[PDB]
Design a protein around this ligand. Structure first.
Ligand SMILES: CC(=O)N[C@H](C=O)[C@@H](O)[C@H](O)[C@H](O)CO
Lengths: 290, 289, 290, 290
């Protein structure tokens, strides 16, 4: 399966008790496919509140997404974890479900050296008949890998690409040039335009759950070299992202979906519950950009 | 009373990464009988806690309690990015008889102060126990202020904090401002300066093998024998430096193995000790023990 | 004078004793005008090793630059430093010499709050009849200005722009959209293409002293929407920048200039004199990209 | 001259326009000697606002300090800066004046490596018949050298010590143990007690300009192992430092001096001036601790 394209980092619906709301999750999935019209879904990433869930919950979500999607669009499973045993188990689980590729965040919390990180990735991908995408996001893990390290990881032909969610466009350009045969995904929604001109093969973002159409436009307009128009869409997109971040990122995106009849529900505690003020702000945000 | 020296309990894992109960019980016995610490801090970073499944975490808590019984004090670190898991673990360890629980600041996601406060309140209000705050900016990237620490202490069931910041200015301020809260030093290599500033004890990974020297540092300081305490800290830091340069958790386990304690391996992706690491560990053992 | 365009952050020539080489300095200047074809020069910047020079040396440099350039190209004078009195004196000196605009880096070393930084800029520009460009460079200063703070500075109609040398494209995009009437200069040579797509009004770079032609191609191809081409020029540019950084930034740029027929000379101590290995490496870099 | 003990990082008095106020400087000096009774003065440091001054001004201050002090107490001259040429010049000037030792901060702004930092220190000390103390400042310069390099620097027998103005107590302890034959000075006023417990040979602080008596008590009492007694003094001193820090460090220390008849004058812009409110607050601090 060709993995290039726009992927929404799937959000998950939870009830007030923190339990998964399958009805709501399937509505979020339907929204992304039918309305946002994205090329695929990145399941189990940060946006899905993955690291706040139990292994059983992660697996349940993986099942629901595969089931609801069927074979309509591509699916990437983020199976990374500080627990390498769990990562391998999730890798096998998602591979057996039929996910088109897997992805793994660099092991965090503890301070692993490159030899250990390489062991982590190889152990995961060598345990399954699938393809792996490296997930960096130095912003949250604190793990900043160099070009030569990535080059050593890319040694493995099953490690087909990387999701770069760092603000280093120098390294991004260097990776594009050095690894012309690997896939490079942008993970920073508010910087999609400058990433696309550097040659990324697609994008994976949390805001695509509600802004998938514009996000696709920024990408396609740039590939068509209509930079002026692409910039304008990025400007509008960033006005939206700025308002969302100021009102609480995940809570606001979920409230935007609720406005459209998608029961995205609550966020997992300790992520705060939306106040009446955040709710009112969400409505104004919706009226301004949708 | 919870004051004193606590070893952040290391766990014995085998080649496959599985818990080795026999080895774990030997590590516990070594800490009590040889290191002579006042208690164990179970489920912390040192125990490789965050690389484990909830089931394994629970087994370790039960084994530790069973082996220790009432011999020394026990604090269970139940913190997690998964608040539901933390609550389950807080209840489980409270039912087991743990003297207190502790919780690292939720990490990975960037939670604001309001959310961190809810996190802590949710955990301790769920059980009939007492809570110690675990603040480790070095691994989590979260550093609070004196004012914030104050709002948290509004919950009477939060009785203290494990300090792991190199900011002794903050430590000095907190000691005088909250003389009724427990403050634990979490940086083995800076135990002496922490003790002179009033910490009520220490929680460290190196005490698994260096508990006697750790106690001397603490007690000498309390008795104003600062010069002698500094010398013990010098030798202790020579050891800590060798261990850090040779692989922290792996080397402590090798040092225990040298004494017949089956401490075993660390869970992958933490590397297995190479031959060079094993040889170095023998040199280290000969020089400091 | 319209200040849009490509500016070379002028390097200065020094002998082995660390004394200014006037002929060399004039050759660098002439090289930028006649060979690099830049729109102007940014004099007194970090690249000119400004902060390692005495106030009198700074003045001689400003005089030589103006005398040599005359009116052929535009001139921007960086007059900032930790010493404000010196800054105000230099703003006067350069304004009287006829510099088209002045620039001022955020005061560093000490931790000045925003009010102090704001007064620093107003004091400087209000002291003369000129226009000022802000110079952030958070990479070497540690000062991180927010969008709102930039808005406070831009209140002064004489503060016409900013040299953005921080790799935060989110803030850059926000700046472009929020201040459409101000000039925004890119200060990251290795990220020229992505910055240009975000609408910058030009670029001020240290590598333009030897790579002015490609820099212009990147900027112009981009403005013409020929992105595939721009990316290829940026790839070669970054291969060069990568080699330069690995061999010693300033030393290698001067050695490259030497190979271009310019007596760039030595860097001032404690910046190391190029070793034999560095010298043969610089010549390899020369044969490779020039 | 043995250089152990308490040293006030000499504050400098300036007039409205920022020019040196020699009458105020000599009064500050006399205060440090006669009232604070310090072991010596550290001239040309950050506290002296040195890095906001020109070479000529730095020279005048060194002359003023030497002339006013005569031989009553020890003097250390900080001659470091980004410009090595100025450093050597000041090292010679100061040695001719009879300063007991010189000090040099690690060159900042630019990102120098160890080899260059080494050449910098050796060049300075090999040029004069004096002794050198290394100045770190990891907080303002961002230079955090390791134990192995410091060891290399100390290979030169005329490099007698180092000034630790960073709370890294692990490195401090390592330095003490590794170099029992070198001097180590604590540069963090609020943590001089735990630093003394770790074996420092003295302290260099900005608050000693007005709190030299308590500072000496803390140092000596801790040296004598009278911890509980040293702690009592540290309790009050840190309450004092907290009030000073909250009202404006340099401004408040100068206001506390004025309360005692010392015309400490202004601070050098862009540093904010002392307001009526800061004056009122400083008066309360004065009544509470003096
Ligand atoms: C190892 C290193 O520090 N850099 C890598 C080159 O080898 C790449 O990441 C690029 O050179 C990059 O520009 C700097 O990291």
């Amino acid at each position: 399966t060709d993995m290039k394209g726009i992927y929404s980092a799937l959000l998950v619906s939870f009830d007030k008790e923190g339990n998964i709301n399958e009805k709501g999750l399937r509505q979020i999935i339907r929204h992304n496919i039918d309305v946002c019209k994205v090329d695929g879904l990145y399941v189990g990433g940060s946006t899905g509140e993955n690291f706040m869930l139990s292994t059983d919950e992660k697996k349940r979500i993986f099942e629901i997404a595969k089931d609801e999607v069927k074979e309509e669009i591509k699916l990437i499973a983020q199976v990374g974890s500080v627990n390498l045993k769990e990562a391998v188990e999730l890798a096998k689980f998602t591979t057996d479900l039929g996910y088109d590729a897997i992805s793994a965040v660099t092991p965090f919390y503890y301070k692993f050296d490159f030899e250990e990180i390489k062991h982590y990735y190889n152990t995961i991908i060598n345990s399954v008949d699938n393809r792996l995408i490296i997930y960096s996001i130095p912003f949250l893990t604190g793990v900043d890998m160099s070009l030569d390290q990535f080059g050593e990881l890319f040694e493995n032909e099953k490690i087909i690409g990387v999701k770069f969610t760092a603000a280093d466009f120098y390294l991004l350009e260097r990776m594009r040039k050095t690894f012309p045969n690997k896939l490079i995904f942008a993970g920073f929604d508010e910087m999609m335009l400058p990433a696309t001109v550097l040659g990324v093969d697609g994008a994976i973002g949390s805001t695509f759950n509600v802004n998938g159409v514009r996000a696709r436009q920024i990408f396609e307009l740039t590939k068509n070299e209509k930079i002026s128009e692409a910039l304008e869409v990025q400007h509008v997109t960033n006005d939206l992202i700025t308002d969302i971040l100021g009102n609480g990122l995940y809570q606001t995106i979920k409230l935007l979906l609720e406005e459209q009849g998608v029961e995205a529900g609550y966020c997992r505690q300790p992520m705060k519950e939306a106040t009446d003020e955040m709710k009112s702000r969400a409505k104004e945000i919706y009226r301004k950009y949708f």
